Amino acid sequence: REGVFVSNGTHWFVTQRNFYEPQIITTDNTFVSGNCDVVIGIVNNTVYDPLQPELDS
């Protein structure tokens, strides 16, 4: 949504463009558009959905 994806080598984070604050990638800090196929250099990772452990109560 804002900022950029990065990896420390083993894990993927989203972070601000101008200051490294690694945030876990979630359905709140990211937006979807279409399926994988079209994007040159897309990568595979989990994106966490904050709602699911809450409704899992």
Add this chain to the structure above:
Amino acid sequence: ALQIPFAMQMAYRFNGIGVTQNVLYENQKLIANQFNSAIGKIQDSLSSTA
């Protein structure tokens, strides 16, 4: 200078005109060809007339 991939710089630059980043990635081949072709038209214009 902080390195960034050019397809990621252009997605920041799309986001800076209120066009959502996915509009670049979903059209990256097309946007690249339009840039390359427009640079071709600059060569043709500058080569054709002073």
